[PDB]
Design an enzyme around this catalytic site. Structure first.
Site, short mmCIF file in Angstrom:
data_model
loop_
_atom_site.label_atom_id
_atom_site.label_comp_id
_atom_site.label_asym_id
_atom_site.label_seq_id
_atom_site.Cartn_x
_atom_site.Cartn_y
_atom_site.Cartn_z
CG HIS A 290 -0.48 0.50 2.12
ND1 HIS A 290 -0.89 -0.78 3.35
CD2 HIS A 290 0.23 1.58 3.17
CE1 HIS A 290 -0.72 0.26 4.87
NE2 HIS A 290 0.38 0.99 4.24
N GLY B 272 2.35 6.72 9.16
CA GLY B 272 4.53 6.28 8.89
C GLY B 272 5.52 5.31 9.59
CB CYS C 89 2.46 1.23 7.41
SG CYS C 89 0.89 1.83 7.99
#
Ligand SMILES: Cc1cc(F)ccc1CS(N)(=O)=O
Ligand SMILES: Cc1cc(F)ccc1CS(N)(=O)=O
Lengths: 304, 304
Positions: free
Chosen positions: B41, B143, B145
């Site tokens: 993603h 941030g 992830c």
């Protein structure tokens, strides 16, 4: 979102942990530049520990009696000195992994990360607070002595704690990196009782701010209070007195959440007076006091 | 003595964290050998996230669209592929700090350390459990992830988790390092409800063993019970059913403490039925289920 008791990344401190052996005693040392810092009770047998004369015990010691091992390479000890309750072993090699660092003596209520080590090898990392009675509630077995407490500011490691003692009550005592004990404790196997372990009120409030931010609000009430009124209730419940300094330090959380500090104090008051009624705040059934205001701002803003 | 929710030392994983930028999206990547692993993603705008066709979105992407930064040096991307819900970016440089490692898919109830990162920079480390509903209760801001969950076995890092999603309920979902989600979750901004978050019964028991070891015994009762009888009570209180496998795994703690597993089950039963009555076990006012039996053995033996 979500709130966790986070430790600082331990990497920069992992690089500084060595094994110090003196005779039969092995514990952890901190290798920064060409100095290895360790508890002075490395020179003691567990017989010595009953009433040790460190000056007398140390006379018998030479540089070659201190065996310093960094991983599976031996460091040459070219000098040894006693600073308060720590030994400084001057080695002939600067730690190539020495980070930017400071030695800082922290105040009670201040939080730091402990890298628990055995034979100079890190086992785990956990977040602590200096209790107002100058103990910490650690996890320390035989060999853990010389494991250090630290804060990381961007790239600079502030070393605040070296582990020395477990008290007869299973709480932990230690020194700053100048070898001065936190509280009235001495490196001697003797009846040492810690005073009242009071709750770090400013920390509980910061954590209540963290709760509101993270959507746990059930405990927010309609009441406010005063510093004096709140502090009467604090006293009864063995909570540290709240100062205007504490109120100032909570400012940004008060600002970010639009809950006045004294309103949150009134929420805390009711929680002390009424308990949780079997409810939980951020997945805890009691009031957490091992997050500082700075800990919440930096967690609920994502500081690296 | 003393018992703490310890994370593994993060150093070996700190060395593997990079920043991955694709257009305007920046998140964390894991650099092992000449591959950088990150959530797929990264290629999505927050518009895409509503119903993303990753195959279609990825066609538009080239190696040079993926900006990989390790500290303040840029890595050249010579290849990119989608494995399930992760991107593998082949870089032209092997991570010189690549530790010995494995990718392992963990089972619910199993515990691991998360290094929460922002822009490839570690912020903190905390110990988690894979909930039986295949969520984790993390601390993850925008941030975070691509921050990874890991266990360390001596010198080998077993990577078990990469962070992808926060659910509308503020719990966290993610994948193994082959990009297969834990539980029924998908990398899409959609109504995803987690099932019943049941308590990890074997973990609570292990933690009760840890309590007894550390001198907190008040909860030890005169009663025993049976697996079937205990499990009736487990069911009512949303506790995972206890198997003979769980009883086998607790063996050493049962052995070390000389408390039979079923006797401790009877202690747990009374605690579920009667609550704590405002008392605490290892400084907690509820039953902790984020220590595994292996976690207690290795903490109360000092494994590095
Ligand atoms: C991650 C982090 C970084 C920091 F600088 C200060 C605090 C924290 C979170 S905590 N309160 O659990 O230690
Ligand atoms: C220090 C440690 C090492 C290990 F291998 C497994 C567990 C622990 C302690 S805990 N349960 O807090 O993660």
């Amino acid at each position: 979102s979500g709130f966790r008791k986070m430790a600082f990344p331990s990497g920069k401190v992992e690089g500084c942990m060595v094994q110090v052996t003196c005779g039969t005693t092995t514990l952890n040392g901190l290798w920064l530049d060409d100095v290895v810092y360790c508890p002075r009770h490395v020179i003691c047998t567990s017989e010595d520990m009953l009433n040790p004369n460190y000056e007398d015990l140390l006379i018998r010691k030479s540089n070659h009696n201190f065996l310093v091992q960094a991983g599976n390479v031996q460091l040459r000890v070219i000098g040894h000195s006693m600073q308060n309750c720590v030994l400084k072993l001057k080695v002939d090699t600067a730690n190539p992994k020495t980070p930017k660092y400071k030695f800082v003596r922290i105040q009670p209520g201040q939080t730091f990360s402990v890298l628990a080590c055995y034979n100079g090898s890190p086992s785990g990392v956990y977040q602590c607070a200096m209790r107002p009675n100058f103990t910490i509630k650690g996890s320390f077995l035989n060999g853990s002595c010389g494991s250090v407490g630290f804060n990381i500011d961007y790239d600079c490691v502030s070393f605040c704690y070296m582990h020395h003692m477990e008290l007869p009550t299973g709480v932990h005592a230690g020194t700053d990196l100048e070898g001065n004990f936190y509280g009235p404790f001495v490196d001697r196997q003797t009846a040492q009782a810690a005073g009242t372990d009071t709750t770090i009120t400013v920390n509980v409030l910061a954590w209540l701010y963290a709760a509101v931010i993270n959507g746990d609000r059930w405990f927010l009430n309609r009441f406010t209070t005063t510093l004096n009124d709140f502090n009467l209730v604090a006293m009864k419940y063995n909570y540290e007195p709240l100062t205007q300094d504490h109120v100032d330090i909570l400012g940004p959380l008060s600002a970010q959440t639009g809950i006045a500090v004294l309103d949150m104090c009134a929420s805390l008051k009711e929680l002390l007076q009424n308990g949780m009624n079997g409810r939980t705040i951020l997945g805890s059934a009691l009031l957490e006091d091992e997050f500082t205001p700075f800990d919440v701002v930096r967690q609920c803003s994502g500081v690296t």
